[PDB]
Amino acid sequence: PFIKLGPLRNVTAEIAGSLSAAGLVLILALCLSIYGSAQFQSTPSIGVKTLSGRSVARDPLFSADGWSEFAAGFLVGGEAGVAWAYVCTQI
Amino acid sequence: THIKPSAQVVWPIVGQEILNGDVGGGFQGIQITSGFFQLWRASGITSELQLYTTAIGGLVMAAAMFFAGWFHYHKAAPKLEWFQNVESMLNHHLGGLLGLGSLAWAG
Amino acid sequence: KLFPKFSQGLAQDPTTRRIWYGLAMAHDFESHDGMTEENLYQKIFASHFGQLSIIFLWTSGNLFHVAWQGNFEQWVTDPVHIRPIAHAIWDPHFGQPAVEAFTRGGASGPVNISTSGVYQWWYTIGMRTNQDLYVGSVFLALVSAIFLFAGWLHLQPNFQPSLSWFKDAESRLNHHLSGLFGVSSLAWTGHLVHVAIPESRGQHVGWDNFLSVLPHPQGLTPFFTGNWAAYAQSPDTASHVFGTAQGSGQAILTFLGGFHPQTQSLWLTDMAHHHLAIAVIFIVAGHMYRTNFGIGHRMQAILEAHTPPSGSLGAGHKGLFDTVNNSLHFQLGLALASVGTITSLVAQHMYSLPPYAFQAIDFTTQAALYTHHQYIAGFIMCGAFAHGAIFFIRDYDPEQNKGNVLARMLDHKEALISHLSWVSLFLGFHTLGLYVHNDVMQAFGTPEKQILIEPVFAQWIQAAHGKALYGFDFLLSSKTSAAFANGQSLWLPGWLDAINNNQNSLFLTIGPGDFLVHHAIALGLHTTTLILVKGALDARGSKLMPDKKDFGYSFPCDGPGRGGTCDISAYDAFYLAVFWMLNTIGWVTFYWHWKHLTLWQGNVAQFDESSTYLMGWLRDYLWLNSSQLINGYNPFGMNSLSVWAWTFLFGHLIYATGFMFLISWRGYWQELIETLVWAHEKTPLANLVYWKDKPVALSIVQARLVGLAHFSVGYIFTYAAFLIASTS
Amino acid sequence: GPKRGSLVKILRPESYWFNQVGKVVSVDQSGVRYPVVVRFENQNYAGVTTNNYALDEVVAA
Amino acid sequence: MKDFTTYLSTAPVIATIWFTFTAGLLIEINRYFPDPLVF
Amino acid sequence: AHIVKIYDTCIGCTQCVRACPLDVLEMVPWDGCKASQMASAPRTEDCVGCKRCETACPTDFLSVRVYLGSESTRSMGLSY
Amino acid sequence: DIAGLTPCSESKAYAKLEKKELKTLEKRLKQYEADSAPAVALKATMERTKARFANYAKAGLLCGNDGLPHLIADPYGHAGEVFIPTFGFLYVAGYIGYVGRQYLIAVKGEAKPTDKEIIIDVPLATKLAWQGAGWPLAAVQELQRGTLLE
Amino acid sequence: TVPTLNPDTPSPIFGGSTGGLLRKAQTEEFYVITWEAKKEQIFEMPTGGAAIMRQGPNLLKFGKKEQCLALTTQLRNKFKLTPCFYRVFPDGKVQYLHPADGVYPEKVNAGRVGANQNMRRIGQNVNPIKVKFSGRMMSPA
Ligand SMILES: CC1=C(/C=C/C(C)=C/C=C/C(C)=C\C=C\C=C(C)\C=C\C=C(C)\C=C\C2=C(C)CCCC2(C)C)C(C)(C)CCC1
Ligand SMILES: CC1=C(/C=C/C(C)=C\C=C\C(C)=C\C=C\C=C(C)\C=C/C=C(C)/C=C/C2=C(C)CCCC2(C)C)C(C)(C)CCC1
Ligand code: SF4
Ligand code: SF4
Numbered sequence A: 001p002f003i004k005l006g007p008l009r010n011v012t013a014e015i016a017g018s019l020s021a022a023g024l025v026l027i028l029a030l031c032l033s034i035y036g037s038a039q040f041q042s043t044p045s046i047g048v049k050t051l052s053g054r055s056v057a058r059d060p061l062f063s064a065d066g067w068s069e070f071a072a073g074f075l076v077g078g079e080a081g082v083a084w085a086y087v088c089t090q091i
Numbered sequence B: 001t002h003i004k005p006s007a008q009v010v011w012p013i014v015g016q017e018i019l020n021g022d023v024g025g026g027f028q029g030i031q032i033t034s035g036f037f038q039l040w041r042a043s044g045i046t047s048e049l050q051l052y053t054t055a056i057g058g059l060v061m062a063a064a065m066f067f068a069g070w071f072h073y074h075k076a077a078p079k080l081e082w083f084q085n086v087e088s089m090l091n092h093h094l095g096g097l098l099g100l101g102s103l104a105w106a107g
Numbered sequence C: 001k002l003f004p005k006f007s008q009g010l011a012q013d014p015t016t017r018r019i020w021y022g023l024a025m026a027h028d029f030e031s032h033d034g035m036t037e038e039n040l041y042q043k044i045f046a047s048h049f050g051q052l053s054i055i056f057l058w059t060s061g062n063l064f065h066v067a068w069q070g071n072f073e074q075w076v077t078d079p080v081h082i083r084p085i086a087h088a089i090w091d092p093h094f095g096q097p098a099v100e101a102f103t104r105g106g107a108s109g110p111v112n113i114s115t116s117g118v119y120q121w122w123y124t125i126g127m128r129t130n131q132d133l134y135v136g137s138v139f140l141a142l143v144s145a146i147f148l149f150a151g152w153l154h155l156q157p158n159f160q161p162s163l164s165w166f167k168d169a170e171s172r173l174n175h176h177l178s179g180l181f182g183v184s185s186l187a188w189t190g191h192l193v194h195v196a197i198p199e200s201r202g203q204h205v206g207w208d209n210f211l212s213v214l215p216h217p218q219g220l221t222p223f224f225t226g227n228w229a230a231y232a233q234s235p236d237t238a239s240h241v242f243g244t245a246q247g248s249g250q251a252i253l254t255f256l257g258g259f260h261p262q263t264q265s266l267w268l269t270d271m272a273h274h275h276l277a278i279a280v281i282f283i284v285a286g287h288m289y290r291t292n293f294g295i296g297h298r299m300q301a302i303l304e305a306h307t308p309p310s311g312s313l314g315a316g317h318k319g320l321f322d323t324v325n326n327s328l329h330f331q332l333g334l335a336l337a338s339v340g341t342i343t344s345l346v347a348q349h350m351y352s353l354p355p356y357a358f359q360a361i362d363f364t365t366q367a368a369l370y371t372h373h374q375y376i377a378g379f380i381m382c383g384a385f386a387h388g389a390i391f392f393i394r395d396y397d398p399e400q401n402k403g404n405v406l407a408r409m410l411d412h413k414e415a416l417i418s419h420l421s422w423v424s425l426f427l428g429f430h431t432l433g434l435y436v437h438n439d440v441m442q443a444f445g446t447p448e449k450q451i452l453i454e455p456v457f458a459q460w461i462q463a464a465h466g467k468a469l470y471g472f473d474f475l476l477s478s479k480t481s482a483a484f485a486n487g488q489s490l491w492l493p494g495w496l497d498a499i500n501n502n503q504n505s506l507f508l509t510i511g512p513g514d515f516l517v518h519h520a521i522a523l524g525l526h527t528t529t530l531i532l533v534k535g536a537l538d539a540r541g542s543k544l545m546p547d548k549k550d551f552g553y554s555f556p557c558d559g560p561g562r563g564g565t566c567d568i569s570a571y572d573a574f575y576l577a578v579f580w581m582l583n584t585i586g587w588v589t590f591y592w593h594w595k596h597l598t599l600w601q602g603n604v605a606q607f608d609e610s611s612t613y614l615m616g617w618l619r620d621y622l623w624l625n626s627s628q629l630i631n632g633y634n635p636f637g638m639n640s641l642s643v644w645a646w647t648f649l650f651g652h653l654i655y656a657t658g659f660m661f662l663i664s665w666r667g668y669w670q671e672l673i674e675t676l677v678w679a680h681e682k683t684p685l686a687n688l689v690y691w692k693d694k695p696v697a698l699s700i701v702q703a704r705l706v707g708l709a710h711f712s713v714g715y716i717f718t719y720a721a722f723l724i725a726s727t728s
Numbered sequence D: 001g002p003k004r005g006s007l008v009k010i011l012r013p014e015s016y017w018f019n020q021v022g023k024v025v026s027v028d029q030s031g032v033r034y035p036v037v038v039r040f041e042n043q044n045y046a047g048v049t050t051n052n053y054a055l056d057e058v059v060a061a
Numbered sequence E: 001m002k003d004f005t006t007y008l009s010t011a012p013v014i015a016t017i018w019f020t021f022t023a024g025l026l027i028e029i030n031r032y033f034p035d036p037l038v039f
Numbered sequence F: 001a002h003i004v005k006i007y008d009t010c011i012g013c014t015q016c017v018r019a020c021p022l023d024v025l026e027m028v029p030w031d032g033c034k035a036s037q038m039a040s041a042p043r044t045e046d047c048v049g050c051k052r053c054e055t056a057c058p059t060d061f062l063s064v065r066v067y068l069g070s071e072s073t074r075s076m077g078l079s080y
Numbered sequence G: 001d002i003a004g005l006t007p008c009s010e011s012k013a014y015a016k017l018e019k020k021e022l023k024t025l026e027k028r029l030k031q032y033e034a035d036s037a038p039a040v041a042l043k044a045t046m047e048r049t050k051a052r053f054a055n056y057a058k059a060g061l062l063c064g065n066d067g068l069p070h071l072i073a074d075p076y077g078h079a080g081e082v083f084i085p086t087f088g089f090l091y092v093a094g095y096i097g098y099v100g101r102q103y104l105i106a107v108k109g110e111a112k113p114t115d116k117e118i119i120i121d122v123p124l125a126t127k128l129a130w131q132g133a134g135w136p137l138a139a140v141q142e143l144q145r146g147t148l149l150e
Numbered sequence H: 001t002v003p004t005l006n007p008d009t010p011s012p013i014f015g016g017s018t019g020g021l022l023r024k025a026q027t028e029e030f031y032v033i034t035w036e037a038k039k040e041q042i043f044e045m046p047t048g049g050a051a052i053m054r055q056g057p058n059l060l061k062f063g064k065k066e067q068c069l070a071l072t073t074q075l076r077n078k079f080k081l082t083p084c085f086y087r088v089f090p091d092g093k094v095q096y097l098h099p100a101d102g103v104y105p106e107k108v109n110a111g112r113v114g115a116n117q118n119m120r121r122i123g124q125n126v127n128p129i130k131v132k133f134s135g136r137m138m139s140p141a
């Protein structure tokens, strides 16, 4: 996105587009760390069973220590994952 | 090209006279935008007399429709069965009304 | 257990409403959990401090940026041909030619033109350099911090005042009348004498030397002697140039009247004497209520004594002491009423008698101000009438006010409401009737058939004031009148000279176009007061709903049954009343704007001839003076009126959203949301996210406020963009 | 109670017919509180021509 | 025709038979006395 | 939840119970009225505040009143 | 004169408003023959429009710097402008109102009054219509008598 | 007399609709309705849709008590039947609701003492100055 449509599309065009993709990453991390800050106070809450109907173990997708490692995954994935759209299109 | 279509005149009172504008052909009035003048040319109308005669016919037709409406409620009101003849209604409306309509028009 | 900390009831709300109300409930003390009279008064007091601290910080902010980013010094040297800088702009969104465009004045980047009249204010008071602005900015910031301090200070149990102290009304009245009004105006007069007057005479007097500089040659000899006339011995000459020695006198206190001819503002000597004079009346009068000395009046006794014979006013004012001293909303109603009147008072006297040097030469500033204070006055008035009924509901004691002026007021309220209705319908019918009549005659090309009533009564008043145009020869017009002969050798020469200069705003010329618009404004007044008064008096009970007082000040309705009860609450009455506020002051501000615009333009005959019909307003006011505005950009290029035109459309867009929230109501939107909340919950991936706060439609009362807010903001912003862009 | 069909003024302030006239239909001779059943010519907002009142909330005039 | 006359004496009919009267009256008077701003 | 009260002017015509969509009101014996019965509101935690009850009352003035109060998940008509 | 404004009988602008309007219609009338229909209208309007101006000059209204006749609304140069008409209204409005009063009261006592607001008793109304001619003499006498107020 | 037992019985024929249950039934209180339909005749789904009733005992599942008392009044008025209905909680508990005391609330049943019953005229309420300095309202006195 932030390469070809931006203000410096008609020129620093991909350096311009690079760290701007690295940004919505870090804000999502605030959004997802702040999303997590409110919700989980005591234990998880999901549809426990499968389609088969037997009581399977509950997922850590929804928990106190859950969304933390996701919010971390969204950061380290995002920031690094951004760098490789401008090591391949630029460098 | 050089006359503005007009078919309304104002009476001379209360300054409304000014509404009778310079519309051409030596006539003073309100310029119409209904598009009747062109209909009339398309229908082949040439003189006013013809317009008068068409007008009187429409008035008779108005009388006939009013008569029809009183009749089909107060003397001879059709039965539910009647109104439900959808196939017949559809056929007659498609073929008589639209069909014979545009046919005779095309005449 | 959750925020709202102050409400269990709202805190247990499972939805997004909890949030909204929480924001909305924040300042309503009486409605919070476990509240007492003590906590009420104390929180109110602290809140007052808080307000003051925000005000002083705000004022300091202005001074700060004028000093730091403005061209204050370029203005003083040349006030006539320099556009006063408010602030610098650093906008990363601007394009190349935008940055060029907004670089006005002597600025090294983009700048905005001040239309606040703070320049002429300052400048007239004595402010000369950026340094002065900086020192004032520091001071007032210090006062802001001090006020904040003070707020938390009387929060501690040692410094917590008692309710008895809050109820000591006599003391507060004495102190405010003598000290806050008397002393502070005396001290100002001190500032005018010591700093402003010398500054206008071209002698820069500062903290470092005032004490060493004589304002008068034989100073403080007249004062004690009783030879006060010496203070008025030699005023500034008619050829005096402001801020310079040339033509300057030595007098410090005069009654000259009229204006300083080059600046066209009131004489700082007159202003000095004015502030001093009022100061004395305040100081003497502020020793009137009884406190800790035994000498003074009883409020209660005065009020209870004033009951006329043969019970034409019932029990008179018996019981009003208690119902006022108890009721806080009553005090806020009186306060807001008076404040609203004086706000318009200020607006109407300031324009016709401008007090600042080289104001009134600034068109845009004047227009901006006069619109400002009339809208502020309107809102303040609606608010006065909004704590009117809050009294009527929550506070009134029917037994304790038995047969008083207040209870008797409630008694014949149908008469009051119905007669206001008459007065508004009369005006509405006739004024509109005479305008639309005037338009039809204009349309048919017969303007000679117009109904143009000449305002004989105002033209009479102007004559009594000394304008000679109309040739009635009354009072200050007629040379053979005691009123003339008395003060002819006092100030009337300055006065009469000013009233009859028709290039100034002082008692403008009046014709039939003035006549119609004032009755439009009267329609404005009477109808808004109809809504507000009706809302106040029927806040307690009606025939449709006798138990309304059990519900309170804002409620959606009382159901669809027995006819339907939408917009039944006094809340909603005030809501309805705001729209007339808006419309009425809309009319007044237009009236104002045009009648000046045509004066400045040099053709008053444009106004007199087109103000007699409404197309005239549409064509010659609205259509003409937006020409430049709407051009701020086009497909070809751009100019400096970008922001106003942007904001013009911004205001319109705000204005139409408001219509959305006003017209369409809840049931649609909730069911909309109802399908959306299913939609989310069976959308995969998105499934993994769920809300904490259940999504719900805004309330009725919420919809009511949110519409009103958008409407008002759009109103104000749109006009402001128009007013400024056109006048500039 | 009042005699049947007598013209009676209402004195209950919270009524739609307050200080207005109605006719008595029948005063219930029992231990009921509002025995005086009144019917009026003009309806209220709630489409009702009739109501019940106590002996101190009527005055035959 | 007791019935037909009651209908002619209905609110919307009377209003119209009244307004065409007090309209004409005012159009009429504006004909023979045209353009008044006095009397 | 919302507050619902029945006053003593009740005739016990039962329209307010019969009208309710959420069964808040009921009829109880009493000694005050010709119908020997009065209305009662024992289930106001389920009360939504839609005011059908009020619209249904024949008494002047109404002998049921609904005061909209602190709002809970049920009173806000939620199915989600 | 009053408020310094000129009289229409003398004033220049007013007499130049005559000229402009007339000389608008004479620029139209050129585009038609003299025998024609619209020429008799553009002559008749002119005659009427030129008569109209003459009849305010004879009336003696005050015309301003605008050229338009302004009005006087208090006392005696210009009584007929407002002071006389004013009574005209209060009469005919009082006429309408008091007829309407005498109708509603005259119905009031007749089992169902609401029917007479819709199927109006015409021959009742048309008798009250004429009775309502002398209304101020009745209106006063009714304020005296003390049947006017509830 | 005894409130209803809470057994397993088959729900009536239905292709399914979007108007039905959601997250609220899983982590809040959903609602269950019981009745003995005589024949198989169609009914209006209060959360949208056509649905055929079955003979013998029929139970439905809803997430609001309005959806019960809209249906029950549609089952009671049209077909002239008589349904019972009660709540459910997500840990497996039940709350018996209607008819609470066997008798429906409109016609009188002994053993249902009066609640929120003010014993004065409404205009005999006190003014809301006389209920400040509390957490109280205008009617309860
Ligand atoms: C002269 C003049 C003037 C003035 C005036 C005035 C100042 C007035 C006042 C007035 C007033 C101060 C009034 C009062 C009133 C009161 C009352 C109280 C009323 C009453 C009424 C009634 C009672 C009525 C009745 C009726 C009738 C009679 C008929 C119809 C029906 C009815 C029922 C409506 C002016 C300048 C303007 C103009 C010129 C002339
Ligand atoms: C508004 C403004 C501002 C502000 C202001 C202020 C807020 C001020 C304050 C304050 C002040 C600025 C004050 C001053 C004062 C002074 C004084 C006060 C002095 C004194 C001295 C002396 C020496 C005296 C003494 C004595 C004697 C001798 C006797 C008696 C006693 C006594 C002690 C008085 C600014 C500029 C920023 C901006 C613009 C405008
Ligand atoms: S407000 Fe909405 S709900 Fe309350 S009555 Fe009017 S319409 Fe029915
Ligand atoms: S409706 Fe009014 S009267 Fe009929 S029962 Fe419910 S309460 Fe008693």
Ligand code: SF4
Pocket: F002, F004, F019, F020, F021, F022, F023, F024, F025, F046, F047, F048, F049, F050, F051, F052, F053, F054, F066
């Ligand atoms: S309000 Fe609607 S729900 Fe609450 S009780 Fe009265 S009727 Fe039943």
